């Protein structure tokens, strides 16, 4: 079944046509028609099937059909575990509402609280949010959420894994329940996921299964290479690598889309040709770029690890993890298997600072063989002075460097493995020198006794 079969609005059909999507996966074809009918949806699809459109088409259709306005507040709320997933969904929603007069916005932990408060006060019809910041804005900021008709919970297994259980309990308690359609998605099925589906969804769900049963998570047939490099030289090493492994196939993973955009512009100026896949471009541009990379003899493509999680990775010589991996288990097992390849074995290199070496101990516990890569100091192409002159003289590159630095710091702060990757152990001066700064720009890393005679409160109203 194709997208023209359902009687969508002409604005939504035109937007999907511009994306280039004419055929659906199983999860879209099996979720969009029941969700347009008003039924709550329980899903079992993984990241990369196309679940984003599967929960964004009914929300956009509801917002357009009820004629929502910015004075009406939030109509649909999409809760995501991490900030980069929220930004990917925000890019998809920006592409989807190209012709829709409805507003869309993102609320993520680590951004400006006052600017987000003003954005919510002005009116955001589709709100893609992170649980802690969403709860903070729901509790302490004045904005309209009384006309809520759609609550999408995406990737609930990861959110329950990070520790947002009580946050989602208060979120479901706060949010209105009458005439609200709930769509919850999770790649696994645990007891906490069942509890969340019980408190959130109505008594009658619809359980849809799009998942491969032959997951090859074997812990022996693998080999993960790593290189220990200090922060202030990290990019330089990558640049040297990306100039020495020319005439080869390299995939590079970054933590954020903003750093991908910054390094794309940076490598354009520093005469190293690359290809970029970040969520600020058209979906058509991204598909054409990935198709061109898939049918090339050489070249390097830089993208986000969560952006290429749902991507058919071709045969490449090198898979480089420049930034800390968002999902270390998934990274090691699945990305090492896609790095080894169907034919002659490629290699999966991981960039480690000399403060995250405990990851190696984790690789000792999982019984995964490791390979250490060293590099001579004299073979690093030193372009640091040119980089600093470029950052100091170019206003657009300075802005991109600041955005990439902030995105890297915030993604490092919101990390599942906080023991291996701790922001407090990071030297901000050195990593900003890696981004090309003489001084590190200002960022927020974080973002007894009871009273005498005090008995617990039993009455009164606090707002």
């Amino acid at each position: 079944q194709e997208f023209s079969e359902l009687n969508l609005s002409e604005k939504t059909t035109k937007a999907i046509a511009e994306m280039g999507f004419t055929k659906m996966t199983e999860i879209q074809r099996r979720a969009i028609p029941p969700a347009l009918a008003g039924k709550d949806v329980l899903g079992a699809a993984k990241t990369g099937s196309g679940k984003t459109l599967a929960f964004l088409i009914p929300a956009v259709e509801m917002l357009s059909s009820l004629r929502f306005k910015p004075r009406n507040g939030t109509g649909a709320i999409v809760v995501t575990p991490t900030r980069e997933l929220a930004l990917q969904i925000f890019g998809v929603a920006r592409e989807l509402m190209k012709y829709h007069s409805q507003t869309y916005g993102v609320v993520i932990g680590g951004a400006n609280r006052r600017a987000e408060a003003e954005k919510l006060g002005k009116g955001v019809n589709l709100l893609i949010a992170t649980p802690g910041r969403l709860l903070d804005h729901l509790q302490n900021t004045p904005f309209v959420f009384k006309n809520l008709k759609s609550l999408i919970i995406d990737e609930a297994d990861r959110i329950l894994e990070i520790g947002f259980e009580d946050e989602m309990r208060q979120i479901v308690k706060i949010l209105p329940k009458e005439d609200r359609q709930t769509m919850l998605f999770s790649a696994t099925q645990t007891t906490k996921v069942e509890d969340l589906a019980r408190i959130s969804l109505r008594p009658g769900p619809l359980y849809i299964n799009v998942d491969e049963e032959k997951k090859y998570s074997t812990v022996e047939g693998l080999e993960q290479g790593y290189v220990v490099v200090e922060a202030d030289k990290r990019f330089l090493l990558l640049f040297s690598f990306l100039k020495k492994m020319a005439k080869k196939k390299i995939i590079v993973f970054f933590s954020s889309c903003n750093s991908v955009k910054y390094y794309s512009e940076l490598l354009q100026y520093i005469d190293l040709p690359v290809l970029d896949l970040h969520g600020k471009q058209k979906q058509q541009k991204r598909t054409n770029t990935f198709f061109e990379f898939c049918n090339a003899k050489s070249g390097t493509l830089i993208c986000t690890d969560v952006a290429a999680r749902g991507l058919d990775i071709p045969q490449v010589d090198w898979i480089v993890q420049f930034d800390p991996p968002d999902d270390p288990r998934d990274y090691i097992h699945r990305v090492g298997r896609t790095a080894r390849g169907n034919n002659g074995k490629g290699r999966s290199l991981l960039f480690l600072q000399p403060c995250e070496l405990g990851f190696l101990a984790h690789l000792k516990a999982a019984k995964v063989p490791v390979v250490e890569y060293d590099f001579p100091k004299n073979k690093i192409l030193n372009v640091q002075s040119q980089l600093e002159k470029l950052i100091s003289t170019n206003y657009y590159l300075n802005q991109s460097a600041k955005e990439g630095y902030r995105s890297y710091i915030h993604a490092y702060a919101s990390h599942s493995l906080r023991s291996v990757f701790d922001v407090h152990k990071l030297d901000l001066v050195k990593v900003a020198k890696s981004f090309g700064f003489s001084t590190p720009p200002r960022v927020d890393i974080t973002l007894g006794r009871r009273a005498y005679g005090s008995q617990p409160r039993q009455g009164g109203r606090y707002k």
């Binding site: 507040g73 003003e118 006060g121 004045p142 904005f143 309209v144």
Partner: protein
């Protein structure tokens, strides 16, 4: 009494006319170290370093006029003692 549909209001920029700003906190902390202490603040700090918190609170209340101002001053001087010990 009468039933009307209450609106959600725009956030007032006059709200919190004190300081949640980090720069004013930085300036306040730097000036404290540079300027030094008042004689009564030094007496309160020498009582707090000896563990005589009750006398310190009474002295602060007597020389400030309010129990809340005394509490705030005693917490500020205890914080100064804590960072002075940390630097020591």
């Amino acid at each position: 009494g009468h039933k009307t549909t209450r609106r959600v209001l725009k956030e007032r920029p006059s709200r919190r006319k004190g300081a949640q700003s980090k720069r004013t906190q930085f300036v306040r902390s730097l000036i404290r170290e540079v300027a030094g202490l008042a004689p009564y603040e030094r007496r309160v700090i020498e009582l707090l370093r000896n563990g005589k918190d009750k006398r310190a609170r009474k002295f602060s209340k007597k020389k400030l006029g309010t129990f809340g101002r005394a509490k705030r001053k005693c917490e500020e001087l205890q914080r100064i003692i804590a960072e002075s010990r940390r630097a020591h």
